[model samples]
Every structure is written in C-alpha cells, then in structure tokens.
Target: MIINNLKLIREKKKISQSELAALLEVSRQTINGIEKNKYNPSLQLALKIAYYLNTPLEDIFQWQPE
Candidate 1:
C-alpha cells in the first residue's frame, strides 16, 4: 500500500495539510487523508508531492502493508 514520512516533512517544511493541498492543487481532505494514513497516493502524485516538499520520492513514500 502506502507508507510515508508526511509528518516529518510537514514539520520540517513548516507546512500544514491545507497549505500543502493548496500548493498541490488538491483538496485539504486529500492532504488530510495522506497525513491520516487513510489514502495512498498514486506514484505520480507521490512524486509530485515529494517534489514540492523538496524531498526524494522514497523519502516521502514507500511500499508497506495497509
């Protein structure tokens, strides 16, 4: 499924989910789900998000049990 270091990155970047969503052009719920571990982003979206956070794709995401 999906694995992430979202909390770490968010804290490091000093960004909230709503702000990240705005930067990504997605809803806050989308970012919330990511933070809440309720949704797994697609590979492309994961990479896009990582790019915005200035982190590597693997740094933000990984394969893991659901």
Candidate 2:
C-alpha cells in the first residue's frame, strides 16, 4: 500500500507532524513513520487522520504497483 502523502500535504498546509499528531492524539513517531512510508496505520487510525486533515480516506492511502 502507498501510505501517507501526509508529509507533503501537511507541508502544503503549513502544519508540522507534531501538530497533526496532536490533532489525532497519536505519537509523533507514528506520524513520522507514516510519513516515511515505514508504517501502516490501522483502518480506524487512517480514517481518523483523514478526518483530522479534512481529506478523504483514499487521499491518505491506497494499493499501488509493487
């Protein structure tokens, strides 16, 4: 899965990972790992992130070419 274009979007929106994590009640490392494509969120967490970011869940992640 292609997880987290959040770093790009957050930067565009001028929000830091710390800030985003605070909004979602998650650890900064969770955001960092997601941003770096090193972690995959649970469906619920992903949905929460999408909601907090005011985007669709599909905007957060997707299945892509291997």
Candidate 3:
C-alpha cells in the first residue's frame, strides 16, 4: 500500500484543495480523495503535486508492506 503526507504538507503550506487542484489542473475532488487515501494519483500527477508543493516525491509518498 502507499501512504502519503499530502494533507499534512499542503496544510503546512497553507494551500487549499481547490487552489492546489487548480495549480495541478485536476478536480478538487481528486485532491480530496488523495488526502483521504481513497485514490492514488498517476505518476505524472504525483510528480506535478510534488513540484507544486515544493517537496520531494518520497517525502509525500511512502511504501508500506501491506
């Protein structure tokens, strides 16, 4: 499974879901689902998120054995 710190980082950066979604050209629901762990982003989208958040990909996402 994949665990992510998307919400933590985003909140720390004081960015709202809608704002981040607009920056990434994705729907707000997509970002919402990502934070809730109900969805996983595509590689391209993930990279874009990392770029927008000014964080490393690994800093946002981590692998778990489960």
Candidate 4:
C-alpha cells in the first residue's frame, strides 16, 4: 500500500509530514497513512510525490501482498 522507504527518504530530506502535506496539497492525515502504510495514493498524487521528492516512482511505491 505504501513505500517502505518514503519515510526514510522524507526524513533524509528533512521534511516534516505536515510540510510534505502542504507541498502535496493533501491533508496531514493522508501523509500519515502514506508513511504508515495504511493506504495507497492515487497515480496523480504518487507521481507528484515522487517528482516533488526527486525520487523515482518505483522508489516511492511498492506493491505488498495482502
């Protein structure tokens, strides 16, 4: 549902979840779920995040068996 490394990368970039949320125009709760692996983001949002973070989409999302 989420990337195992997004939180790590985000932290490495020194960005708070709240700040990321603002940059992405999404709610902090959405950012929280993304980091926590509770939900998946839309393709549009996912691409935006990857581009914003300067990381590839593959580095941001991974499909997990559930």
Candidate 5:
C-alpha cells in the first residue's frame, strides 16, 4: 500500500488545500483526494507535491506491505 502523510505535512506548513492546489495547478478536490488517500498522484504530480511541501518524497509517501 502507498500511504502518505500529506495532511500532516501540509498542516505543519500551514497551507490550505486550496492554496496548495493552486500552487500545484491542480484542483482542490485532487489535493483533498490525495490527503484522504483516495487518489494516487502521477509521478510528476507527486514530485511537484514534495517540492512544494519542501519535504522529501519518502517522507511524504511510504510503501508498506498490505
């Protein structure tokens, strides 16, 4: 399973979902889906997210046995 700490990290950075979405050129629903683990971003999108959050990809996303 691919799990993420997106919400936690975003909150720690004090960025709203809409704000992050705008910065990423994606929709708020997309960010919301990612935070809720309902959507998995494309590799490009994932990298962009990590870049904007100033967090390493591995710190935001992790692979776990399911």
Candidate 6:
C-alpha cells in the first residue's frame, strides 16, 4: 500500500516539476499527478524520467497487486 517517492527523488536531484515537465514535454500537473500516484505515465515517459535522474526504472515505479 505504498507508492514510490517520486517527488522526493526529483527534488533530491534538484529537478523542479516545471523543469521536468519541459524535459518530458509534459505539463507540471502531469508530473505532479505522477508524483502523487494519481496518474501513470506511458512507458516512454517513465523510462525518460529514470534516465534523466540517473536512476533505474524500478526505482521510479513499483505497484503491488492486491
């Protein structure tokens, strides 16, 4: 019942939502939604984020099935 701390990781990397938005060609709200676990990004966007942050994809997303 826990989501990844996407917001924390991004902030730790000194990447703002707006900055990440521009990098990913998405809206700040979209980034916010992802961080808040209210939205799921496409595979492309997710991979881009992991690469941008110098992190592994698994570090960014993990969903536990019920």
- Candidate with best lDDT: 3
lDDT of 4 at 56: 74
The 10-residue segment of model 4 with minimum total lDDT is 1-10
Per-residue error (Å), model 1, residue 32: 2.0
Q: Per-residue lDDT tens digits of candidate 2, residues 1-66?
A: 575677676676887889889988999798878767777777788888888877766666654546
The residue pairs that clash in candidate 5, if any, are none
Considering TM-score, which of the candidate structures 3 and 5 is the better prediction for this target?
3
Best by TM-score: 3
Give residue 53's lDDT in candidate 4 (0 to 100). 70
- Per-residue error for 41 in candidate 5, Å, reads 0.7
Q: What is the lDDT of residue 44 in candidate 4?
A: 92
User: TM-scores, in order shown?
Assistant: 0.72, 0.77, 0.82, 0.75, 0.81, 0.75
Residues 20-60, model 5: lDDT tens digits: 88877899887777757776778898899889877877766
Per-residue lDDT over 1-66 for candidate 3, one digit per residue giving the tens place of the 0 to 100 score: 888777777888888878988988999887778758767788898899899877877766665547
What's the C-alpha lDDT at position 13 in model 4? 76
Local distance difference test, per candidate?
A: 0.72, 0.75, 0.79, 0.72, 0.77, 0.71
Residue 35, model 5, lDDT? 55
List clashing residue pairs in candidate 2.
Answer: none
Model 4 Cα RMSD, 1 decimal: 2.5
Counting only residues 3 or more apart in sequence or on different chains, how many pairs clash (N, Cα, C under 3 Å) in candidate 1? 0
Screening candidate 4 with a backbone cut-off below 3 angstroms (N, C-alpha, C), the clashing residue pairs are: none
Order the candidate numbers by lDDT, best to worst.
3, 5, 2, 4, 1, 6
CA lDDT, candidate 5, residue 51: 91
